[PDB]
């Protein structure tokens, strides 16, 4: 988690149960342990005036 | 309490599957191979330090 008190980037928060002043600071969770995968495909021009998928 | 956390690393022999790999032989005949590896953590301190964090 990234916790910000009135948008000042308070600190970094480890997993588990935690406490924060309600209506004062906000926490944004982000997936760090998980591994993310992306697929990129295209018809692309080569050196010898050739196109390949 | 509330300040110290712990990471778990299993010492068992761990298997890993590689599927539908494509390999070209000496005579340029491409053929599909699927194999498997089995690895064990020889030293846990080195495994944690060298690898990114402590993730498998």
């Amino acid at each position: 988690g990234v916790v910000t008190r009135f948008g000042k980037f308070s600190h970094l928060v480890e997993p588990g149960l935690n406490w924060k002043p309600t209506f004062i600071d906000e926490v944004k969770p982000v997936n760090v342990e998980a591994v993310r995968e992306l697929a990129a495909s295209g018809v692309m021009l080569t050196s010898d005036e050739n196109v390949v998928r | 309490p509330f300040i110290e956390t712990v990471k778990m690393l299993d010492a068992r022999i761990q298997t890993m599957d590689n599927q539908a790999d494509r390999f070209v032989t000496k005579e340029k005949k491409d053929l599909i191979v699927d194999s498997y590896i089995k690895w064990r953590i020889s030293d846990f301190s080195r495994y944690y330090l060298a690898t990114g964090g402590g993730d498998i």
Binding site: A34, R36, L38, A39 | -
Partner: protein, 63 residues
């Protein structure tokens, strides 16, 4: 986050989905980049599970 069912479909056929959990009509959809959004089924689709399985998408039931 609420996302409609159609774009969830052409995301499934364009294999950006990794895990889908179906408790009831709703589906908890996780993308390949670990972004999750809920979807609602408009009406029961017999081809839905078949399409999900053929695209090698992880499917999770619920108690």
């Amino acid at each position: 986050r609420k996302v409609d069912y159609s774009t969830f479909l052409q995301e499934v056929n364009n294999d950006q989905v990794r895990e889908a959990r179906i408790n009831g009509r709703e589906i908890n959809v996780t993308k390949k980049d670990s972004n999750r959004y809920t979807t609602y089924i408009p009406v029961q689709d017999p081809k839905l599970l078949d399409n999900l399985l053929t695209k090698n998408v992880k499917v999770v039931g619920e108690p």
